[PDB]
Design an enzyme around this catalytic site. Structure first.
Site, PDB file in Angstrom:
ATOM      1  CD1 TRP A   1       1.669   1.307  12.722  1.00 25.16           C
ATOM      2  CD2 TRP A   1       0.465   2.783  11.552  1.00 25.16           C
ATOM      3  NE1 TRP A   1       2.428   1.701  11.647  1.00 25.16           N
ATOM      4  CE2 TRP A   1       1.713   2.609  10.912  1.00 25.16           C
ATOM      5  CE3 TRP A   1      -0.466   3.668  10.993  1.00 25.16           C
ATOM      6  CZ2 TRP A   1       2.050   3.287   9.742  1.00 25.16           C
ATOM      7  CZ3 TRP A   1      -0.128   4.337   9.829  1.00 25.16           C
ATOM      8  CH2 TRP A   1       1.117   4.141   9.215  1.00 25.16           C
ATOM      9  CG  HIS A   2      -1.396   7.181  13.474  1.00 20.94           C
ATOM     10  ND1 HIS A   2      -0.420   7.764  12.695  1.00 20.94           N
ATOM     11  CD2 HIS A   2      -2.428   6.905  12.640  1.00 20.94           C
ATOM     12  CE1 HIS A   2      -0.836   7.823  11.442  1.00 20.94           C
ATOM     13  NE2 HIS A   2      -2.053   7.309  11.382  1.00 20.94           N
TER      14      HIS A   2
ATOM     15  NE  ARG B 228      -8.006   9.430   1.907  1.00 21.12           N
ATOM     16  CZ  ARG B 228      -6.874   8.759   1.723  1.00 21.12           C
ATOM     17  NH1 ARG B 228      -6.708   8.001   0.640  1.00 21.12           N
ATOM     18  NH2 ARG B 228      -5.909   8.838   2.631  1.00 21.12           N
TER      19      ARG B 228
ATOM     20  CG  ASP C  85       4.575  10.567  -2.789  1.00 21.78           C
ATOM     21  OD1 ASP C  85       3.378  10.370  -2.482  1.00 21.78           O
ATOM     22  OD2 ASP C  85       5.538  10.143  -2.111  1.00 21.78           O
TER      23      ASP C  85
ATOM     24  CG  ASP D 179      -0.174   6.911  -1.439  1.00 21.67           C
ATOM     25  OD1 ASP D 179      -1.231   7.107  -2.069  1.00 21.67           O
ATOM     26  OD2 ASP D 179       0.400   7.799  -0.773  1.00 21.67           O
TER      27      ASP D 179
ATOM     28  CG  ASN E 255      -4.726   9.086   6.293  1.00 18.38           C
ATOM     29  OD1 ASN E 255      -4.716   9.925   5.390  1.00 18.38           O
ATOM     30  ND2 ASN E 255      -3.726   8.236   6.484  1.00 18.38           N
TER      31      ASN E 255
ATOM     32  CB  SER F 179      -1.965  13.256   6.491  1.00 23.54           C
ATOM     33  OG  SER F 179      -2.040  11.862   6.729  1.00 23.54           O
TER      34      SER F 179
ATOM     35  N   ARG G 171      -6.743  16.514  -9.139  1.00 20.91           N
ATOM     36  CA  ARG G 171      -5.511  17.296  -9.115  1.00 20.91           C
ATOM     37  C   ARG G 171      -5.241  17.924 -10.472  1.00 20.91           C
TER      38      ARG G 171
ATOM     39  N   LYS H 146       1.576  17.797   7.115  1.00 19.97           N
ATOM     40  CA  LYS H 146       2.344  17.437   5.928  1.00 19.97           C
ATOM     41  C   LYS H 146       1.613  17.864   4.663  1.00 19.97           C
ATOM     42  CD  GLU H 147      -2.907  14.988   3.159  1.00 23.60           C
ATOM     43  OE1 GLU H 147      -4.011  15.562   3.227  1.00 23.60           O
ATOM     44  OE2 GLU H 147      -2.793  13.763   2.950  1.00 23.60           O
TER      45      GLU H 147
ATOM     46  CG  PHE I  34      -2.274  -0.600   1.019  1.00 20.54           C
ATOM     47  CD1 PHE I  34      -3.040  -0.303  -0.100  1.00 20.54           C
ATOM     48  CD2 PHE I  34      -2.818  -1.413   2.008  1.00 20.54           C
ATOM     49  CE1 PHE I  34      -4.314  -0.849  -0.250  1.00 20.54           C
ATOM     50  CE2 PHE I  34      -4.092  -1.957   1.871  1.00 20.54           C
ATOM     51  CZ  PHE I  34      -4.839  -1.672   0.734  1.00 20.54           C
ATOM     52  CG  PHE I  35       2.326   2.848   3.533  1.00 20.17           C
ATOM     53  CD1 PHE I  35       1.600   1.828   4.128  1.00 20.17           C
ATOM     54  CD2 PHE I  35       2.126   4.151   3.961  1.00 20.17           C
ATOM     55  CE1 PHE I  35       0.689   2.102   5.139  1.00 20.17           C
ATOM     56  CE2 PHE I  35       1.208   4.431   4.982  1.00 20.17           C
ATOM     57  CZ  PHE I  35       0.507   3.402   5.573  1.00 20.17           C
TER      58      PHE I  35
ATOM     59  N   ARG J 266       2.394  20.819   1.474  1.00 16.48           N
ATOM     60  CA  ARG J 266       2.394  20.552   0.044  1.00 16.48           C
ATOM     61  C   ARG J 266       1.257  21.247  -0.688  1.00 16.48           C
TER      62      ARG J 266
HETATM   63 MG    MG Z   1       4.418   7.686   0.793  1.00 19.99          MG
HETATM   64 MG    MG Z   2      -0.728  10.997  -2.866  1.00 19.09          MG
END
Ligand code: MG
Ligand code: MG
EC number: 4.2.3.7
Length: 303
Positions: free
Chosen positions: A302-303, A167, A78, A74, A213, A217, A151, A220-221, A70-71, A224
Site C-alpha cells: 500500500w505504501h 503499540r 490528533d 484515529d 509504520n 511516519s 501523552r 511527520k511525527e 480506522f483512519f 509534531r
Molecule cells: Mg489521521
Molecule cells: Mg494519534
C-alpha cells in the site's frame, strides 16, 4: 519482498474504490467535499483490497469500511483529546459500547460507524469467535487510553518492550486479521488460533506493521514532537542515533519475516498436534494465506 509472500489484490478493487465514500458519508463521518477529497487521498480502499484479496462485493466493502473507520477514528486523537486519557476514554467507551448492545442515537458518528462495522462483522460468525474478536477490540480501545495517559504525563516509553506492550494493541492489526476471516466466511480453528505457533505468527504480523509504520511516519511525527515512535524510543533505550535505530528496526523486520517462514513450516505438525479434521485444515490454510500473509504484505504494498 524480503520473503516470498505474493503481492495480492482483490479483483473487485476498482468498484470498491469507486464506491468507498458512500458508507462514511451516510454515517456522518465525512462532512464536506474537502474532507472527502482528503479521505480519497488516503487510498484506504486500495489498502483494504490488499488485506482482503479474497473478498469481493459486500465483503470487500466491509473491509474498505474498516480501513476508512480506522483512519477517521484515529483522527479524533490528533488534537487535545489524545493528550488526556479521561477525554480519550470518554470517546472510546462510547465506541466500545457497541460491543455490548445498540447505541443511543445521540452517540457520536464514529461510534455509530463502529457499531455498523461490528454488526456486519459478526454475521455468520460463531459466538465464541465474536467474543474473541470483541476482546481484541477492547484491547485496541484500552491501548488508545494508555497512549493518551503517556501523552498526559509527558512520559514516553524508555524501552522497546514497554512501547510494544502498548503499540501492539493500537496498531489495529489483530482486528484487521479478524475481519479477513469474516470477509472470507471462514474461521481458523480456535484451538489453533490460541496455539503458541500461531500466536508467534500473529505477533510477527503485528510487529512488522508497527515497525514499518513508525519508519513511514517518522518525519511527520518528528515535526509534531512525537516521542512514542520506535525510533525515538530506541535512541533513549540504547543511546543510539536515529540513523542506527532505523537500521536496527529494518534488521528486525527482515529477521522476523524470516522467522515467519520458519513458523509457517511448523503448521503441518501443529495441525496434527491439534488433530484438525479436513475442514479445519482447510480453514487453517485460508487463515495462513488470506488473513496472516495478506496483513503482513498488504501495508508494505500500500505504501
Ligand atoms: Mg489521521
Ligand atoms: Mg494519534
Amino acid at each position: 519482498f524480503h520473503i516470498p509472500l505474493p503481492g495480492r489484490q482483490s479483483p473487485d478493487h476498482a468498484r470498491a474504490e469507486a464506491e468507498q465514500l458512500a458508507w462514511p458519508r451516510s454515517l456522518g463521518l465525512i462532512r464536506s467535499d474537502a474532507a472527502a477529497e482528503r479521505h480519497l487521498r488516503g487510498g484506504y480502499a486500495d489498502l483494504a483490497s490488499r488485506f482482503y484479496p479474497h473478498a469481493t462485493g459486500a465483503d470487500l466493502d466491509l473491509g474498505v469500511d474498516l480501513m476508512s473507520w480506522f483512519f477517521l477514528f484515529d483522527d479524533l486523537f490528533d488534537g487535545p483529546r489524545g493528550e488526556n486519557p479521561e477525554d480519550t476514554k470518554q470517546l472510546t467507551d462510547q465506541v466500545a459500547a457497541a460491543l455490548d448492545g445498540p447505541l443511543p442515537d445521540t452517540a457520536p458518528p464514529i461510534a455509530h460507524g463502529f457499531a455498523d462495522i461490528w454488526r456486519r462483522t459478526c454475521e455468520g460468525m460463531t459466538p465464541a469467535w465474536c467474543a474473541r474478536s470483541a476482546r481484541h477490540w477492547r484491547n485496541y480501545f484500552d491501548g488508545y487510553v494508555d497512549e493518551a495517559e503517556s501523552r498526559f504525563w509527558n512520559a514516553p516509553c524508555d524501552s522497546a518492550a514497554q512501547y510494544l506492550a502498548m503499540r501492539r494493541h493500537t496498531i489495529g492489526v489483530q482486528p484487521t486479521v479478524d475481519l479477513a476471516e469474516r470477509a472470507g466466511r471462514f474461521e481458523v480453528p480456535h484451538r489453533v488460533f490460541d496455539s503458541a505457533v500461531m500466536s508467534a505468527m500473529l505477533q510477527i504480523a503485528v510487529d512488522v506493521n508497527l515497525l514499518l509504520n513508525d519508519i513511514a511516519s517518522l518525519e511527520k511525527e518528528e515535526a509534531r514532537g512525537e516521542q512514542n515512535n520506535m525510533v525515538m524510543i530506541l535512541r533513549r533505550e540504547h543511546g543510539w542515533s536515529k540513523s542506527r535505530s532505523v537500521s536496527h528496526m529494518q534488521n528486525e523486520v527482515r529477521a522476523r519475516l524470516e522467522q515467519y517462514l520458519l513458523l509457517e513450516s511448523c503448521l503441518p505438525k501443529v495441525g496434527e498436534i491439534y488433530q484438525l479434521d479436513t475442514a479445519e485444515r482447510e480453514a487453517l490454510e485460508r487463515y495462513r494465506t488470506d488473513a496472516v500473509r495478506t496483513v503482513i504484505r498488504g501495508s508494505y504494498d500500500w505504501h
